[PDB]
Amino acid sequence: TIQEFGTVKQFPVALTMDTRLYSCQRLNKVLADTRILHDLYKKYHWLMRGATFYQLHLLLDKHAGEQLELIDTVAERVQTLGGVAVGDPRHVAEITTVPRPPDGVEEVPSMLSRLLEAHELILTECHDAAARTQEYGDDGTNDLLVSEVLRTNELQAWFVAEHLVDTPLVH
Amino acid sequence: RTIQEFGTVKQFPVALTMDTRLYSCQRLNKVLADTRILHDLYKKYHWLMRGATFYQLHLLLDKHAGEQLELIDTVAERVQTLGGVAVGDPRHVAEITTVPRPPDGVEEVPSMLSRLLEAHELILTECHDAAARTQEYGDDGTNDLLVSEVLRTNELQAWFVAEHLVDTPLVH
Amino acid sequence: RTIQEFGTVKQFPVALTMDTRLYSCQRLNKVLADTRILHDLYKKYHWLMRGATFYQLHLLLDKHAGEQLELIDTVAERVQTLGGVAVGDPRHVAEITTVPRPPDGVEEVPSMLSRLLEAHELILTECHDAAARTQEYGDDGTNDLLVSEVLRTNELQAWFVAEHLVDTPLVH
Amino acid sequence: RTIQEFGTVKQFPVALTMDTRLYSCQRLNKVLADTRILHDLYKKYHWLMRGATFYQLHLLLDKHAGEQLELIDTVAERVQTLGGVAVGDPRHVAEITTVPRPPDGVEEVPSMLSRLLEAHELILTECHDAAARTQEYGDDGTNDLLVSEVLRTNELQAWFVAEHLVDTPLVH
Amino acid sequence: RTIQEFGTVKQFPVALTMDTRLYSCQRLNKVLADTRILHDLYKKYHWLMRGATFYQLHLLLDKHAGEQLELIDTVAERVQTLGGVAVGDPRHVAEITTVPRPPDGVEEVPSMLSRLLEAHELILTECHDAAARTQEYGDDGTNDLLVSEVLRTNELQAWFVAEHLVDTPLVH
Amino acid sequence: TIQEFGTVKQFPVALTMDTRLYSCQRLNKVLADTRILHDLYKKYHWLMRGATFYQLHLLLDKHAGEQLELIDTVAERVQTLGGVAVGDPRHVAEITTVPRPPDGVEEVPSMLSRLLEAHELILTECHDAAARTQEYGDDGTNDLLVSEVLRTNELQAWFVAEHLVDTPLVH
Amino acid sequence: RTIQEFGTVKQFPVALTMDTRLYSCQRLNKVLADTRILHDLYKKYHWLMRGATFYQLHLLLDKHAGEQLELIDTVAERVQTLGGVAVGDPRHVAEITTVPRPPDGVEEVPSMLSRLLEAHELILTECHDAAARTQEYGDDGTNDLLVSEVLRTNELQAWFVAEHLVDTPLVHA
Amino acid sequence: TIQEFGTVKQFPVALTMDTRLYSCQRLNKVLADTRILHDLYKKYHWLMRGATFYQLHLLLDKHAGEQLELIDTVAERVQTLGGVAVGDPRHVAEITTVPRPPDGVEEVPSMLSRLLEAHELILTECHDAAARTQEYGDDGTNDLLVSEVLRTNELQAWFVAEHLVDTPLVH
Amino acid sequence: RTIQEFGTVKQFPVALTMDTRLYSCQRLNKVLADTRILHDLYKKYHWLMRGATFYQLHLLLDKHAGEQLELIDTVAERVQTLGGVAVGDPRHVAEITTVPRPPDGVEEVPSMLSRLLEAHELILTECHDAAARTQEYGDDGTNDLLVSEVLRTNELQAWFVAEHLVDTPLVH
Amino acid sequence: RTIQEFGTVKQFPVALTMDTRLYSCQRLNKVLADTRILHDLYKKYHWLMRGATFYQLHLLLDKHAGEQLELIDTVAERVQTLGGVAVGDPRHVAEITTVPRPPDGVEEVPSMLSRLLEAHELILTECHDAAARTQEYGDDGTNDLLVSEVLRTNELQAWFVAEHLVDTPLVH
Amino acid sequence: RTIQEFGTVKQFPVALTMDTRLYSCQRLNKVLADTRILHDLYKKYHWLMRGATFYQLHLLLDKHAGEQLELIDTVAERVQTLGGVAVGDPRHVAEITTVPRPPDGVEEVPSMLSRLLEAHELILTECHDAAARTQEYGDDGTNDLLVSEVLRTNELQAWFVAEHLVDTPLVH
Ligand SMILES: [Fe+3]
Ligand SMILES: [Fe+3]
Ligand SMILES: [Fe+3]
Ligand SMILES: [Fe+3]
Ligand SMILES: [Fe+3]
Ligand SMILES: [Fe+3]
Ligand SMILES: [Fe+3]
Ligand SMILES: [Fe+3]
Ligand SMILES: [Fe+3]
Ligand SMILES: [Fe+3]
Ligand SMILES: [Fe+3]
Ligand code: NA
Ligand code: NA
Ligand code: NA
């Protein structure tokens, strides 16, 4: 094994080893939680049912695609810093704090609430990680976490949360 | 210095009399003002939407807004083509339109949809009248714009909006 | 004057016996006829849809209609490729199909969805049988068209439609 | 349960009287039924074509079929926009259309083309009449659809098809 | 051995009487000849342009030329659709057109622009009159082409060109 | 009315009610001013005339298209925070401090100046809103204000201001 | 130095026995050799075409050539995927194909079309047989390639070509 | 008139006035003949008839569009040399040597034959003009005449001439 | 029945003499035969490639194959344009080409690349000589084809291929 | 005649003080000069590349060059937006930059890669410092450009380049 | 360790003698150095532009810069194809080019335009000569690149630029 998980290599990218180590630790937690959220979106894209099936099917897929891009961008930021991005999902399972859903099919409003819980969890960790990596001098990491991870999750949580509003649709 | 007053037409090489062009411009500016309000109502509701059909209605309302924005630009360009002055700032629009102001906050979903239908019907009524009158004065191009673009677009959109107001079972 | 009768195959350079080609043509024309009715059921419901999920189902039904139209053309061209005659006018379709005629007017939404699912199931049942028999007679290409295109498309479409019938809460 | 009968219009906020809407719907349904047969004649001949100009006619007939299919959807949506019920299943189309049924099998090429032309001319005649009558009732949008889309598309298609029947030398 | 003389129409299955078709062809051919000259004026000035606004005007005049070339094809195809003969070689165009010949060399910029506007106005004047008369003879399609495409295009183009001739300060 | 203007609802976006409410207040001001600026650009696209007509007609339309996207993004941000985006232009008129132009056609250089004045008013409010929202913990709103609203208006203002420079064009 | 001889398979991690892979590669290479000649016949006639229907046939023959070229690549890659060696230089193709060589010069139009139909029929006969035998050996993927691509494409193409040989009136008597 | 037809202005494109005047004279002749040929292709695209109508209608339009591009490139080369491109078609008529067709509809094979006579007239001129312009040092004009004008017209002549071959199509 | 023998040119209106066209056809057919071999060598190696740079070389060799395939078509069409007969079946190519036949199986990677370079160099030597001779005989267009397309493409490809054979350190 | 000297800012309507805009323009011109050298190094190595990974590295270096070219334009425009004067001719760049000049000829592959990494590191170091100081002066837009575009693009590019320098077994 | 010195050519399989290749590389590197400066002049003026025609000239200058950037890459690749070393760092460009350095700051608009015309003429002059001589030494491909790409592009761009310097009335 030529590089252990949790170490960084000597990289000429104008950031100290301690800053790069710290950023990789923070990014990998966001990454593990985003991996789970992408798979929750795909799970609900497949398992959806009900009179709004096609609308929610399509919405959940649009969110999964955007989460997939977040995953790749965050992982490549870990590599760019000289670290090792979390790889196999059995490792993601050890790092993440997004809870495991039931193996079978939940009620539709439970599926939506679970996605929102995951969004809020990531959003909270993201605000803190963005603040701390900035304090370490890692401007590029802070910009990634805010402009991409935080803004994408906030807009997604909006689209999902408005579907849970119980309000009449016809007079 | 104002180089041209609102409510006037200039000498223009477009083979229609001054009186004809002034009249078409007055009729087009009314349709233009009401359409400006209707574009903004569709965006208002695109943003404020909520409920179990949010993504469907968010998307549909945006499709209709984009179509209204295109109508704005082509009716405004028609006014300019006729040598007139298209309505500009929305504070001026406010003085010309008869589409009522909605509440500042968030209405119930069916009220938003009913308000869009009222605005459609208002514009359709004006369009039929304006198309007949402009035709009579010989402005064939304005009549064509009003019928083929403004009227037909607003009819089709009112259909799409009206169907979502139907209360009917979705499951057995 | 008729240059080729319906229900015949011509001498054709495609390495299948006349017997095999005649039989594949007959089974394809049944599938083509039921598919023609299904396409038209999807367009009928695309137009006649109403209710709180209008735009959603309007779009979904058009998506399925477009996919059925492509199946129609691929199946028809397969009939021709085997030297047969594909079913043409819809009055001939009517005499071949076993998909029942819906009411002339507007059904309840969930009855429209149930009617589609019944037409899917009838086509799927025929496909399984037609694919097995044409395979036994050696028409590998026909079996591949019927399994990979007709059967798979209808199975997936039936899934999309049947999920909309599930009566399940959407909000807490 | 039928929730709307064929041949009725519902109350609808499109600024046209019930009279006008009902009459436009009847006229549009007849054009729609004839167009449905014409679309299927183009596809039939797309598949059944043969002879030294096969690829060129296979392609031309498909281009025309695609244009007819869009006219069908536009015309049907216009019926729905007027609060009417668009003709759905082709067994209903068969009861409304006056375009005759061709042979089940394969006709001579010039006869297929002639049958297309007779169908176009029937639709063109219907169109000029419906256009003039719907205009008299104030349905400006229906008139514009019939003229700018249905009439002009069928006139241009008839020209392309008719030129193929000219018996004229191709080489010196 | 010419197979059809210019100025005639052949018997043609487009539901319009020979008298109606012949008249529409005569009017369309006049619009065609003028538009041919106008396209070539736009190209000449695209190439011969110069001055501080060269690139802007070079692009605008090409944009207009491209739109006129499409009008040429549509109008010519309409003549053929009606069974007539569209004007061909530019030496025949030169006998029909009333658009004046420009100098062979290079005019001042404002003169090129005024010449364009004069051509536009001549076409628009012809268009209004032909649209009214073809409509009287019942040629609904030809009226729609002349108004929705020929007239409205030239109206807008003349607006874009005319605004460049306004002498007004650009800077404080 | 199911939610009053000037309020925020309970919403799962991991930000306190006070921070969200303040963000929505600042964004609605930016949004009203931007709504006027979009309409100024469209007004001048149509009313333009003179020797540079096509050039300016195209430029003002490019800028209007960009402002229209900013409107939609800022309004969706208000909604994302559980707030209510300014809707009808008669409400916009009560919030904006961008002045009303004449109803008619002004001189070309006067149109250009009026656009610049509007840009400058927006930029001024943007620098202030970006600093204050960041101090309250609303990272995403700060990023939207800086990366999108401020940078777009700075760039547009440059393009418009260069057309005002009285300098020779030929020898 | 040869690093792998033609007509062998290497040890390859694709869950198919050496005997199964070797047999599929022999059948695929014959189809590939015949399809190489058929591609080149369609390009030959795309160039040499003439007559009142020149542009129609010129286009149609190119559409078919492009489809045959994509079949060649897909079949060759299948041979490589099985650890085999795809037939390379056309002088080797010459030794494997059974599609007859045409005249060097320009034939009559209906003879060109007939020669294409004869080549399709040859390939279709080989495909049904190779599909059945590769399926019996357990090479599901090879069977699917031969049926869904090779067979179906050649069937459809033969239809389009064969219809142009129908002698039938085009205008009324 | 600020510049007479048949003159070249002083222009910073590294070729003598004499060379430029001669190239422009040769290009304007190619251009006038090309204008007539563009219009012949459009004429026949519209007047076409018979069992191969759609085929020939499409081919003639494909060739017309290629001729239209050659017109624009050739005219722009005239301008680039500081000359004046032939403008109105009434002027083309005075320069061209392509004969006028009947006003009405000719037989299909005479249409094609007339196109070929027009191609051949242009090809013959191009070979001569390419050689003469090269000898005077106008390398750019020679490349335009050879690579664009000559090669397009040769390929078009091939596609047109093959349609005149009287040969069986069926056995 | 052969209607035109290989190695002849028919009368053809391309403004080049019969002896000129015959010589250009002969030269173009030798280029064409050699290019047909080179295309098939690129494809052979695209498939047979292996080693640590497999993907990069698989992609490069396919890019060059696709460019050679367009050269073939353009060169063959040029022979036809001149009234000649382009080499067709690969068994005829085999009789004309001087590019040697590779081993039937898999060579070492650097021998593959060297064999491509030897084929390029053969085609380039022929091309310079053919471009000079066809030019002297007045066939300007054939010279331009040989230089601008055949020569330049082969020279660029040979550079890309040759750089991969440079033995040089890649890491410190 | 210079109408604005290099190293000055003009009075400009972008809500930042003259001192703030002058300082940003200084820092941005240094980043700009170094980035100009870096783009040209990527293009130099795109062309000079050789060896067994030629095509891979040729493509990667072009991808990075294109990204650097876009940063050049965005940074140069930011200087202009601030009312400054962006560095123009490469002879002025050479007076400002601190990226050292490479050999005129061809270096070993890993020395090319090392030189790029040293250039990235230089730029990255300048950028962190410029981003901090411009933010302190209130130039939020310049800080955002330096961090989100210049810094993040150089950091990602350095990673891709660095990985190619790792000596590790590739085969079994 | 320099693995090839600048100003040399390596043994390379491209059918041209070492002396021929060396000379073409010399002439191409001079064109390349000059073009590198001209690219940078166009980008400098794209950024520094100002005045009433700012947008039009900003777009025109960028169009021309993108065309020069492609020429740089094609010419440099031709040097490498011939086994030479293309000029890399702009500090080496500075030692080869004869296009003078412009002022560091902002010139008047007509001065920018005149300076571009000067650089185009210098390049055109060099190009005519180099095309003649490399053709004399048998380098057909290099002559073709110089004439069809470098000369023709510079002549066209000089035309576009030069027309903006014509002092001529824009309005009556
Ligand atoms: Fe990636
Ligand atoms: Fe506009
Ligand atoms: Fe088809
Ligand atoms: Fe539809
Ligand atoms: Fe056309
Ligand atoms: Fe939106
Ligand atoms: Fe491949
Ligand atoms: Fe042009
Ligand atoms: Fe071809
Ligand atoms: Fe730029
Ligand atoms: Fe390159
Ligand atoms: Na569809
Ligand atoms: Na219309
Ligand atoms: Na950003």
Side-chain angles (χ1 to χ4, degrees), chain F residues 140-161:
Chain F
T141 290
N142 169 97
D143 182 70
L144 164 54
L145 286 165
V146 177
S147 78
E148 309 180 59
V149 178
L150 189 81
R151 291 181 57 195
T152 297
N153 273 286
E154 287 166 327
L155 194 67
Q156 287 189 357
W158 167 55
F159 271 73
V160 165

Side-chain angles (χ1 to χ4, degrees), chain E residues 18-114:
Chain E
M18 169 188 75
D19 293 344
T20 293
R21 295 180 292 101
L22 201 307
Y23 185 79
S24 290
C25 291
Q26 288 158 174
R27 305 307 303 269
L28 287 169
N29 274 318
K30 178 53 160 65
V31 171
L32 199 46
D34 300 330
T35 296
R36 287 275 297 280
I37 299 302
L38 178 53
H39 166 86
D40 289 346
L41 275 174
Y42 270 118
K43 295 298 305 195
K44 164 189 180 79
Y45 296 149
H46 172 72
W47 301 320
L48 308 198
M49 194 49 56
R50 48 207 69 188
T53 60
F54 171 77
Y55 187 50
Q56 162 195 282
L57 289 182
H58 177 84
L59 294 182
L60 181 60
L61 296 175
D62 211 26
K63 181 172 110 77
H64 287 192
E67 287 159 2
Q68 292 294 335
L69 195 72
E70 294 314 310
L71 287 183
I72 290 166
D73 190 72
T74 308
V75 171
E77 287 187 8
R78 183 76 188 157
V79 172
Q80 309 297 138
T81 292
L82 290 172
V85 180
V87 200
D89 181 280
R91 291 158 284 199
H92 194 196
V93 171
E95 294 165 349
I96 298 172
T97 189
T98 52
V99 174
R101 185 174 164 176
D104 292 352
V106 54
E107 293 153 272
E108 291 196 330
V109 172
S111 294
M112 308 177 163
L113 305 182
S114 294

Side-chain angles (χ1 to χ4, degrees), chain E residues 95-165:
Chain E
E95 294 165 349
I96 298 172
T97 189
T98 52
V99 174
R101 185 174 164 176
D104 292 352
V106 54
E107 293 153 272
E108 291 196 330
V109 172
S111 294
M112 308 177 163
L113 305 182
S114 294
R115 194 173 291 274
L116 295 174
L117 295 177
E118 286 163 13
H120 283 118
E121 192 141 54
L122 200 161
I123 298 161
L124 292 170
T125 303
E126 284 268 6
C127 268
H128 279 297
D129 181 67
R133 298 283 227 90
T134 57
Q135 187 59 68
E136 284 166 39
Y137 312 136
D139 185 356
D140 296 314
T142 295
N143 167 89
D144 177 75
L145 165 57
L146 283 160
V147 169
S148 75
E149 301 175 47
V150 181
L151 191 88
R152 280 178 67 194
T153 298
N154 276 283
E155 282 169 334
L156 190 67
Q157 285 188 0
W159 170 52
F160 275 74
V161 171
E163 301 293 14
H164 294 266
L165 282 178

Side-chain angles (χ1 to χ4, degrees), chain C residues 58-84:
Chain C
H58 177 77
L59 287 179
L60 180 57
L61 303 170
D62 216 21
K63 179 190 186 286
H64 289 189
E67 285 161 3
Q68 295 288 337
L69 187 74
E70 167 158 24
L71 288 175
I72 289 161
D73 181 81
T74 298
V75 167
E77 288 183 7
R78 182 70 186 173
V79 171
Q80 301 308 131
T81 291
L82 300 169

Side-chain angles (χ1 to χ4, degrees), chain D residues 96-170:
Chain D
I96 292 179
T97 186
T98 55
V99 181
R101 183 173 173 181
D104 288 353
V106 192
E107 295 158 88
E108 294 212 313
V109 174
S111 298
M112 300 175 168
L113 300 175
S114 292
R115 184 176 302 273
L116 294 168
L117 297 178
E118 290 159 9
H120 282 124
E121 186 143 58
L122 192 157
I123 286 165
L124 285 174
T125 301
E126 282 286 343
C127 263
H128 291 280
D129 180 67
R133 298 282 312 270
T134 60
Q135 187 57 78
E136 265 151 42
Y137 306 139
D139 192 353
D140 303 308
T142 296
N143 173 90
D144 180 73
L145 168 57
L146 294 170
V147 171
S148 73
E149 293 181 69
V150 183
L151 191 79
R152 284 180 63 194
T153 295
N154 280 282
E155 282 162 337
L156 185 75
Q157 289 190 357
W159 168 54
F160 268 72
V161 173
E163 291 313 1
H164 293 269
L165 289 166
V166 182
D167 188 4
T168 202
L170 302 179

Side-chain angles (χ1 to χ4, degrees), chain F residues 158-159, chain J residues 70 73-74 77, chain K residues 43 46-47 58 62:
Chain F
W158 167 55
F159 271 73
Chain J
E70 295 308 288
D73 183 76
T74 305
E77 290 180 8
Chain K
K43 292 303 291 194
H46 168 75
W47 300 316
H58 176 81
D62 209 30

Side-chain angles (χ1 to χ4, degrees), chain C residues 72-130:
Chain C
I72 289 161
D73 181 81
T74 298
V75 167
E77 288 183 7
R78 182 70 186 173
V79 171
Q80 301 308 131
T81 291
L82 300 169
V85 180
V87 61
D89 186 285
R91 287 153 294 192
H92 196 195
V93 171
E95 291 167 356
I96 300 173
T97 186
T98 59
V99 182
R101 183 185 173 169
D104 287 348
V106 184
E107 293 155 93
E108 277 176 329
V109 177
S111 295
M112 296 170 175
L113 297 180
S114 285
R115 182 174 304 271
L116 295 171
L117 287 176
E118 296 158 4
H120 284 124
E121 191 140 43
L122 183 158
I123 292 168
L124 293 171
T125 298
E126 285 234 42
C127 274
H128 281 294
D129 183 64

